[PDB]
Amino acid sequence: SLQIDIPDALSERDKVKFTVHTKTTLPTFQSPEFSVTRQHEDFVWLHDTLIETTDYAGLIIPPAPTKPDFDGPREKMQKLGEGEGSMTKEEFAKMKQELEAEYLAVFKKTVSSHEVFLQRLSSHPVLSKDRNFHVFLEYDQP
Amino acid sequence: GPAVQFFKGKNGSADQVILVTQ
């Protein structure tokens, strides 16, 4: 079996980090359980690479994940304090709490899109076997 | 502005977001 989930993620400056966790029985992997850190572009790279593969001409590659956008929430958070002085402590806390809820919503949607893409790949009997997909899953220089 | 760290809930555990130094 090939089981992939995204346990955790980080949003920073303008960059988003996903943790891609793999559980597998397959002999082809060096280890049964491992985790790596990947960025949205890495997901895009995999999709494009699968598309390029001559052998997969007759298969439909799963659509790439949507690029994550945290711009509204990040922009608001910077502004929030920012004007910490202007407002009361309860006002500040409630606002910070609100903006956090927003981050979480964006997180839930983007995490799902990235995870679903990987899960579709593992579903495919041919695609799961792909060498590039494997490297994406467990290559860890650090 | 701070980084935000997301933890997917260990179901049925709720998802969490935490403010990270940056």
mmCIF file with all atom_site columns, C-alpha atoms in Angstrom:
data_model
loop_
_atom_site.group_PDB
_atom_site.id
_atom_site.type_symbol
_atom_site.label_atom_id
_atom_site.label_alt_id
_atom_site.label_comp_id
_atom_site.label_asym_id
_atom_site.label_entity_id
_atom_site.label_seq_id
_atom_site.pdbx_PDB_ins_code
_atom_site.Cartn_x
_atom_site.Cartn_y
_atom_site.Cartn_z
_atom_site.occupancy
_atom_site.B_iso_or_equiv
_atom_site.pdbx_formal_charge
_atom_site.auth_seq_id
_atom_site.auth_comp_id
_atom_site.auth_asym_id
_atom_site.auth_atom_id
_atom_site.pdbx_PDB_model_num
ATOM 1   C CA . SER A 1 1   ? 0.000   0.000  0.000   1.00 0.00 ? 1   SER A CA 1
ATOM 2   C CA . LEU A 1 2   ? 0.971   3.628  -0.375  1.00 0.00 ? 2   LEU A CA 1
ATOM 3   C CA . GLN A 1 3   ? -0.445  6.039  2.190   1.00 0.00 ? 3   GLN A CA 1
ATOM 4   C CA . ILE A 1 4   ? 0.252   9.746  1.967   1.00 0.00 ? 4   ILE A CA 1
ATOM 5   C CA . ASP A 1 5   ? -1.034  12.528 4.196   1.00 0.00 ? 5   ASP A CA 1
ATOM 6   C CA . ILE A 1 6   ? -0.020  16.083 4.956   1.00 0.00 ? 6   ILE A CA 1
ATOM 7   C CA . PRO A 1 7   ? 0.270   16.296 8.766   1.00 0.00 ? 7   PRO A CA 1
ATOM 8   C CA . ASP A 1 8   ? 1.500   19.867 9.121   1.00 0.00 ? 8   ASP A CA 1
ATOM 9   C CA . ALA A 1 9   ? 2.288   23.045 7.247   1.00 0.00 ? 9   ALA A CA 1
ATOM 10  C CA . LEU A 1 10  ? 3.855   26.436 7.733   1.00 0.00 ? 10  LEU A CA 1
ATOM 11  C CA . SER A 1 11  ? 3.106   29.813 6.192   1.00 0.00 ? 11  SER A CA 1
ATOM 12  C CA . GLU A 1 12  ? 5.875   32.426 6.200   1.00 0.00 ? 12  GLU A CA 1
ATOM 13  C CA . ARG A 1 13  ? 7.117   35.552 4.387   1.00 0.00 ? 13  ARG A CA 1
ATOM 14  C CA . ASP A 1 14  ? 5.665   34.507 1.053   1.00 0.00 ? 14  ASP A CA 1
ATOM 15  C CA . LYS A 1 15  ? 6.481   30.802 1.236   1.00 0.00 ? 15  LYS A CA 1
ATOM 16  C CA . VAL A 1 16  ? 4.555   27.716 2.309   1.00 0.00 ? 16  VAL A CA 1
ATOM 17  C CA . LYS A 1 17  ? 6.010   24.464 3.597   1.00 0.00 ? 17  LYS A CA 1
ATOM 18  C CA . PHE A 1 18  ? 4.131   21.172 3.612   1.00 0.00 ? 18  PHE A CA 1
ATOM 19  C CA . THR A 1 19  ? 5.192   18.037 5.383   1.00 0.00 ? 19  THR A CA 1
ATOM 20  C CA . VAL A 1 20  ? 4.552   14.978 3.275   1.00 0.00 ? 20  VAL A CA 1
ATOM 21  C CA . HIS A 1 21  ? 4.323   11.806 5.296   1.00 0.00 ? 21  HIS A CA 1
ATOM 22  C CA . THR A 1 22  ? 4.450   8.401  3.727   1.00 0.00 ? 22  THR A CA 1
ATOM 23  C CA . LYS A 1 23  ? 3.431   4.980  4.993   1.00 0.00 ? 23  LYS A CA 1
ATOM 24  C CA . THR A 1 24  ? 4.266   2.137  2.648   1.00 0.00 ? 24  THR A CA 1
ATOM 25  C CA . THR A 1 25  ? 4.614   -1.620 2.461   1.00 0.00 ? 25  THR A CA 1
ATOM 26  C CA . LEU A 1 26  ? 6.155   -1.448 -1.000  1.00 0.00 ? 26  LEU A CA 1
ATOM 27  C CA . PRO A 1 27  ? 9.687   -2.879 -1.303  1.00 0.00 ? 27  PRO A CA 1
ATOM 28  C CA . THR A 1 28  ? 10.707  -0.197 -3.779  1.00 0.00 ? 28  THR A CA 1
ATOM 29  C CA . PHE A 1 29  ? 10.964  2.405  -1.009  1.00 0.00 ? 29  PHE A CA 1
ATOM 30  C CA . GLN A 1 30  ? 14.047  2.293  1.235   1.00 0.00 ? 30  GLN A CA 1
ATOM 31  C CA . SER A 1 31  ? 11.879  2.709  4.326   1.00 0.00 ? 31  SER A CA 1
ATOM 32  C CA . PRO A 1 32  ? 8.324   1.850  5.405   1.00 0.00 ? 32  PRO A CA 1
ATOM 33  C CA . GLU A 1 33  ? 7.672   5.225  7.043   1.00 0.00 ? 33  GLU A CA 1
ATOM 34  C CA . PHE A 1 34  ? 9.239   8.578  6.231   1.00 0.00 ? 34  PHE A CA 1
ATOM 35  C CA . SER A 1 35  ? 8.533   12.296 5.972   1.00 0.00 ? 35  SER A CA 1
ATOM 36  C CA . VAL A 1 36  ? 9.793   15.093 3.754   1.00 0.00 ? 36  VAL A CA 1
ATOM 37  C CA . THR A 1 37  ? 9.204   18.805 3.319   1.00 0.00 ? 37  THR A CA 1
ATOM 38  C CA . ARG A 1 38  ? 7.928   20.077 0.003   1.00 0.00 ? 38  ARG A CA 1
ATOM 39  C CA . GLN A 1 39  ? 6.839   23.390 -1.424  1.00 0.00 ? 39  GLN A CA 1
ATOM 40  C CA . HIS A 1 40  ? 4.066   24.133 -3.836  1.00 0.00 ? 40  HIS A CA 1
ATOM 41  C CA . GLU A 1 41  ? 6.414   24.276 -6.793  1.00 0.00 ? 41  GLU A CA 1
ATOM 42  C CA . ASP A 1 42  ? 7.699   20.792 -6.003  1.00 0.00 ? 42  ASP A CA 1
ATOM 43  C CA . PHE A 1 43  ? 4.154   19.540 -6.436  1.00 0.00 ? 43  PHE A CA 1
ATOM 44  C CA . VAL A 1 44  ? 3.939   21.400 -9.730  1.00 0.00 ? 44  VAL A CA 1
ATOM 45  C CA . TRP A 1 45  ? 7.245   19.952 -10.817 1.00 0.00 ? 45  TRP A CA 1
ATOM 46  C CA . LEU A 1 46  ? 6.013   16.452 -10.249 1.00 0.00 ? 46  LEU A CA 1
ATOM 47  C CA . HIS A 1 47  ? 2.875   16.990 -12.276 1.00 0.00 ? 47  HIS A CA 1
ATOM 48  C CA . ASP A 1 48  ? 4.703   18.522 -15.171 1.00 0.00 ? 48  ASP A CA 1
ATOM 49  C CA . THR A 1 49  ? 7.273   15.715 -15.113 1.00 0.00 ? 49  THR A CA 1
ATOM 50  C CA . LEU A 1 50  ? 4.610   13.024 -15.170 1.00 0.00 ? 50  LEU A CA 1
ATOM 51  C CA . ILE A 1 51  ? 3.042   14.757 -18.142 1.00 0.00 ? 51  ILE A CA 1
ATOM 52  C CA . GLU A 1 52  ? 6.362   14.706 -19.925 1.00 0.00 ? 52  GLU A CA 1
ATOM 53  C CA . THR A 1 53  ? 6.782   11.003 -19.390 1.00 0.00 ? 53  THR A CA 1
ATOM 54  C CA . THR A 1 54  ? 6.286   9.212  -22.701 1.00 0.00 ? 54  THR A CA 1
ATOM 55  C CA . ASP A 1 55  ? 4.863   6.109  -21.065 1.00 0.00 ? 55  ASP A CA 1
ATOM 56  C CA . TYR A 1 56  ? 1.993   7.999  -19.433 1.00 0.00 ? 56  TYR A CA 1
ATOM 57  C CA . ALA A 1 57  ? 0.582   9.379  -22.651 1.00 0.00 ? 57  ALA A CA 1
ATOM 58  C CA . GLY A 1 58  ? -2.564  7.318  -22.248 1.00 0.00 ? 58  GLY A CA 1
ATOM 59  C CA . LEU A 1 59  ? -3.154  8.236  -18.626 1.00 0.00 ? 59  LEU A CA 1
ATOM 60  C CA . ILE A 1 60  ? -4.765  11.298 -17.185 1.00 0.00 ? 60  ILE A CA 1
ATOM 61  C CA . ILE A 1 61  ? -2.376  12.933 -14.746 1.00 0.00 ? 61  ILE A CA 1
ATOM 62  C CA . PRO A 1 62  ? -4.196  14.311 -11.717 1.00 0.00 ? 62  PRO A CA 1
ATOM 63  C CA . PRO A 1 63  ? -4.521  18.078 -11.845 1.00 0.00 ? 63  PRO A CA 1
ATOM 64  C CA . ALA A 1 64  ? -1.902  20.028 -9.977  1.00 0.00 ? 64  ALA A CA 1
ATOM 65  C CA . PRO A 1 65  ? -2.785  21.614 -6.634  1.00 0.00 ? 65  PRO A CA 1
ATOM 66  C CA . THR A 1 66  ? -3.944  25.187 -6.591  1.00 0.00 ? 66  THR A CA 1
ATOM 67  C CA . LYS A 1 67  ? -1.223  27.555 -5.550  1.00 0.00 ? 67  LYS A CA 1
ATOM 68  C CA . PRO A 1 68  ? -1.794  28.545 -1.938  1.00 0.00 ? 68  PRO A CA 1
ATOM 69  C CA . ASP A 1 69  ? -2.748  32.162 -1.325  1.00 0.00 ? 69  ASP A CA 1
ATOM 70  C CA . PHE A 1 70  ? -2.370  33.540 2.200   1.00 0.00 ? 70  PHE A CA 1
ATOM 71  C CA . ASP A 1 71  ? -2.004  37.088 1.002   1.00 0.00 ? 71  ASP A CA 1
ATOM 72  C CA . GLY A 1 72  ? -5.173  38.525 2.506   1.00 0.00 ? 72  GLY A CA 1
ATOM 73  C CA . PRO A 1 73  ? -4.593  37.001 5.931   1.00 0.00 ? 73  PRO A CA 1
ATOM 74  C CA . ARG A 1 74  ? -0.908  37.844 5.969   1.00 0.00 ? 74  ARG A CA 1
ATOM 75  C CA . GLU A 1 75  ? -1.575  41.417 4.916   1.00 0.00 ? 75  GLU A CA 1
ATOM 76  C CA . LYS A 1 76  ? -4.183  41.849 7.623   1.00 0.00 ? 76  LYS A CA 1
ATOM 77  C CA . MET A 1 77  ? -1.964  40.346 10.328  1.00 0.00 ? 77  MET A CA 1
ATOM 78  C CA . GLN A 1 78  ? 0.854   42.783 9.647   1.00 0.00 ? 78  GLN A CA 1
ATOM 79  C CA . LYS A 1 79  ? -1.590  45.671 9.843   1.00 0.00 ? 79  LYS A CA 1
ATOM 80  C CA . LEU A 1 80  ? -3.149  44.326 13.006  1.00 0.00 ? 80  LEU A CA 1
ATOM 81  C CA . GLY A 1 81  ? -0.151  45.396 14.978  1.00 0.00 ? 81  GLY A CA 1
ATOM 82  C CA . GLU A 1 82  ? 0.667   47.774 13.361  1.00 0.00 ? 82  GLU A CA 1
ATOM 83  C CA . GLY A 1 83  ? -2.209  49.410 15.206  1.00 0.00 ? 83  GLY A CA 1
ATOM 84  C CA . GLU A 1 84  ? -1.875  47.636 18.518  1.00 0.00 ? 84  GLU A CA 1
ATOM 85  C CA . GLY A 1 85  ? -1.693  51.031 20.229  1.00 0.00 ? 85  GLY A CA 1
ATOM 86  C CA . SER A 1 86  ? -4.919  52.376 18.770  1.00 0.00 ? 86  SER A CA 1
ATOM 87  C CA . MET A 1 87  ? -7.177  49.735 20.281  1.00 0.00 ? 87  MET A CA 1
ATOM 88  C CA . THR A 1 88  ? -7.945  47.916 23.517  1.00 0.00 ? 88  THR A CA 1
ATOM 89  C CA . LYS A 1 89  ? -6.456  44.591 24.566  1.00 0.00 ? 89  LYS A CA 1
ATOM 90  C CA . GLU A 1 90  ? -9.719  42.732 24.104  1.00 0.00 ? 90  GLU A CA 1
ATOM 91  C CA . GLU A 1 91  ? -10.142 44.380 20.711  1.00 0.00 ? 91  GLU A CA 1
ATOM 92  C CA . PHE A 1 92  ? -6.652  43.336 19.729  1.00 0.00 ? 92  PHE A CA 1
ATOM 93  C CA . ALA A 1 93  ? -7.077  39.793 20.976  1.00 0.00 ? 93  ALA A CA 1
ATOM 94  C CA . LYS A 1 94  ? -10.420 39.277 19.268  1.00 0.00 ? 94  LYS A CA 1
ATOM 95  C CA . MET A 1 95  ? -9.052  40.604 15.980  1.00 0.00 ? 95  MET A CA 1
ATOM 96  C CA . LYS A 1 96  ? -5.961  38.423 16.188  1.00 0.00 ? 96  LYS A CA 1
ATOM 97  C CA . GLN A 1 97  ? -8.231  35.513 16.922  1.00 0.00 ? 97  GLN A CA 1
ATOM 98  C CA . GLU A 1 98  ? -10.326 36.382 13.885  1.00 0.00 ? 98  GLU A CA 1
ATOM 99  C CA . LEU A 1 99  ? -7.370  36.657 11.521  1.00 0.00 ? 99  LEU A CA 1
ATOM 100 C CA . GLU A 1 100 ? -6.085  33.332 12.816  1.00 0.00 ? 100 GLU A CA 1
ATOM 101 C CA . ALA A 1 101 ? -9.371  31.688 11.918  1.00 0.00 ? 101 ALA A CA 1
ATOM 102 C CA . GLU A 1 102 ? -8.850  33.018 8.430   1.00 0.00 ? 102 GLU A CA 1
ATOM 103 C CA . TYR A 1 103 ? -5.389  31.507 8.218   1.00 0.00 ? 103 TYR A CA 1
ATOM 104 C CA . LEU A 1 104 ? -6.839  28.210 9.300   1.00 0.00 ? 104 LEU A CA 1
ATOM 105 C CA . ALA A 1 105 ? -9.496  28.273 6.627   1.00 0.00 ? 105 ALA A CA 1
ATOM 106 C CA . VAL A 1 106 ? -6.972  28.935 3.910   1.00 0.00 ? 106 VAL A CA 1
ATOM 107 C CA . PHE A 1 107 ? -4.818  26.234 5.437   1.00 0.00 ? 107 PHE A CA 1
ATOM 108 C CA . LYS A 1 108 ? -7.566  23.637 5.340   1.00 0.00 ? 108 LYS A CA 1
ATOM 109 C CA . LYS A 1 109 ? -8.375  24.223 1.700   1.00 0.00 ? 109 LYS A CA 1
ATOM 110 C CA . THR A 1 110 ? -4.797  24.369 0.430   1.00 0.00 ? 110 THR A CA 1
ATOM 111 C CA . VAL A 1 111 ? -3.667  21.370 2.468   1.00 0.00 ? 111 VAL A CA 1
ATOM 112 C CA . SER A 1 112 ? -6.495  19.290 1.065   1.00 0.00 ? 112 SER A CA 1
ATOM 113 C CA . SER A 1 113 ? -5.680  20.185 -2.539  1.00 0.00 ? 113 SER A CA 1
ATOM 114 C CA . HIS A 1 114 ? -2.066  19.213 -2.116  1.00 0.00 ? 114 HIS A CA 1
ATOM 115 C CA . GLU A 1 115 ? -2.904  16.026 -0.244  1.00 0.00 ? 115 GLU A CA 1
ATOM 116 C CA . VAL A 1 116 ? -5.633  14.961 -2.679  1.00 0.00 ? 116 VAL A CA 1
ATOM 117 C CA . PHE A 1 117 ? -3.222  15.294 -5.559  1.00 0.00 ? 117 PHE A CA 1
ATOM 118 C CA . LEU A 1 118 ? -0.770  12.931 -3.920  1.00 0.00 ? 118 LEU A CA 1
ATOM 119 C CA . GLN A 1 119 ? -3.492  10.490 -2.958  1.00 0.00 ? 119 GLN A CA 1
ATOM 120 C CA . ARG A 1 120 ? -4.731  10.313 -6.516  1.00 0.00 ? 120 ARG A CA 1
ATOM 121 C CA . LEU A 1 121 ? -1.212  9.484  -7.635  1.00 0.00 ? 121 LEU A CA 1
ATOM 122 C CA . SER A 1 122 ? -0.863  6.632  -5.142  1.00 0.00 ? 122 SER A CA 1
ATOM 123 C CA . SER A 1 123 ? -4.233  5.359  -6.358  1.00 0.00 ? 123 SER A CA 1
ATOM 124 C CA . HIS A 1 124 ? -2.932  4.936  -9.875  1.00 0.00 ? 124 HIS A CA 1
ATOM 125 C CA . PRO A 1 125 ? -1.308  1.544  -10.179 1.00 0.00 ? 125 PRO A CA 1
ATOM 126 C CA . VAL A 1 126 ? 1.154   2.734  -12.824 1.00 0.00 ? 126 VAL A CA 1
ATOM 127 C CA . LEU A 1 127 ? 1.781   6.220  -11.392 1.00 0.00 ? 127 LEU A CA 1
ATOM 128 C CA . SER A 1 128 ? 2.456   5.083  -7.827  1.00 0.00 ? 128 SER A CA 1
ATOM 129 C CA . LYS A 1 129 ? 5.320   3.084  -9.251  1.00 0.00 ? 129 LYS A CA 1
ATOM 130 C CA . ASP A 1 130 ? 6.892   6.162  -10.805 1.00 0.00 ? 130 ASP A CA 1
ATOM 131 C CA . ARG A 1 131 ? 10.527  6.824  -9.929  1.00 0.00 ? 131 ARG A CA 1
ATOM 132 C CA . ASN A 1 132 ? 10.137  10.619 -9.903  1.00 0.00 ? 132 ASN A CA 1
ATOM 133 C CA . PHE A 1 133 ? 7.160   10.366 -7.604  1.00 0.00 ? 133 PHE A CA 1
ATOM 134 C CA . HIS A 1 134 ? 9.258   8.303  -5.224  1.00 0.00 ? 134 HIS A CA 1
ATOM 135 C CA . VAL A 1 135 ? 12.037  10.829 -5.136  1.00 0.00 ? 135 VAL A CA 1
ATOM 136 C CA . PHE A 1 136 ? 9.430   13.454 -4.356  1.00 0.00 ? 136 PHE A CA 1
ATOM 137 C CA . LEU A 1 137 ? 8.201   11.330 -1.469  1.00 0.00 ? 137 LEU A CA 1
ATOM 138 C CA . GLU A 1 138 ? 11.426  10.328 0.338   1.00 0.00 ? 138 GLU A CA 1
ATOM 139 C CA . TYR A 1 139 ? 14.489  12.276 -0.842  1.00 0.00 ? 139 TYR A CA 1
ATOM 140 C CA . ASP A 1 140 ? 15.994  13.945 2.219   1.00 0.00 ? 140 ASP A CA 1
ATOM 141 C CA . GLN A 1 141 ? 19.382  15.658 1.907   1.00 0.00 ? 141 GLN A CA 1
ATOM 142 C CA . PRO A 1 142 ? 19.340  16.919 5.504   1.00 0.00 ? 142 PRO A CA 1
ATOM 143 C CA . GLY B 2 1   ? 4.674   39.701 10.549  1.00 0.00 ? 1   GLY B CA 1
ATOM 144 C CA . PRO B 2 2   ? 4.640   36.245 12.148  1.00 0.00 ? 2   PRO B CA 1
ATOM 145 C CA . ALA B 2 3   ? 4.702   32.914 10.411  1.00 0.00 ? 3   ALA B CA 1
ATOM 146 C CA . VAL B 2 4   ? 1.735   30.652 10.944  1.00 0.00 ? 4   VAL B CA 1
ATOM 147 C CA . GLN B 2 5   ? 2.181   26.985 11.659  1.00 0.00 ? 5   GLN B CA 1
ATOM 148 C CA . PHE B 2 6   ? -0.605  24.566 10.894  1.00 0.00 ? 6   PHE B CA 1
ATOM 149 C CA . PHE B 2 7   ? -1.267  21.241 12.556  1.00 0.00 ? 7   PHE B CA 1
ATOM 150 C CA . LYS B 2 8   ? -3.737  18.865 10.976  1.00 0.00 ? 8   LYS B CA 1
ATOM 151 C CA . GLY B 2 9   ? -5.845  17.333 13.719  1.00 0.00 ? 9   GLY B CA 1
ATOM 152 C CA . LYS B 2 10  ? -5.360  13.734 14.741  1.00 0.00 ? 10  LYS B CA 1
ATOM 153 C CA . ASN B 2 11  ? -8.895  12.853 13.942  1.00 0.00 ? 11  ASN B CA 1
ATOM 154 C CA . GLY B 2 12  ? -11.143 13.472 15.496  1.00 0.00 ? 12  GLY B CA 1
ATOM 155 C CA . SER B 2 13  ? -8.843  16.147 16.865  1.00 0.00 ? 13  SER B CA 1
ATOM 156 C CA . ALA B 2 14  ? -9.427  19.698 15.674  1.00 0.00 ? 14  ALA B CA 1
ATOM 157 C CA . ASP B 2 15  ? -7.029  21.475 13.346  1.00 0.00 ? 15  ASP B CA 1
ATOM 158 C CA . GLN B 2 16  ? -4.786  24.057 14.963  1.00 0.00 ? 16  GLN B CA 1
ATOM 159 C CA . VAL B 2 17  ? -2.902  27.155 13.896  1.00 0.00 ? 17  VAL B CA 1
ATOM 160 C CA . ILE B 2 18  ? -0.135  28.671 15.957  1.00 0.00 ? 18  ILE B CA 1
ATOM 161 C CA . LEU B 2 19  ? 1.745   31.940 15.669  1.00 0.00 ? 19  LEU B CA 1
ATOM 162 C CA . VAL B 2 20  ? 5.421   31.428 14.931  1.00 0.00 ? 20  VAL B CA 1
ATOM 163 C CA . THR B 2 21  ? 8.264   33.876 15.427  1.00 0.00 ? 21  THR B CA 1
ATOM 164 C CA . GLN B 2 22  ? 9.509   35.582 12.293  1.00 0.00 ? 22  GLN B CA 1
#
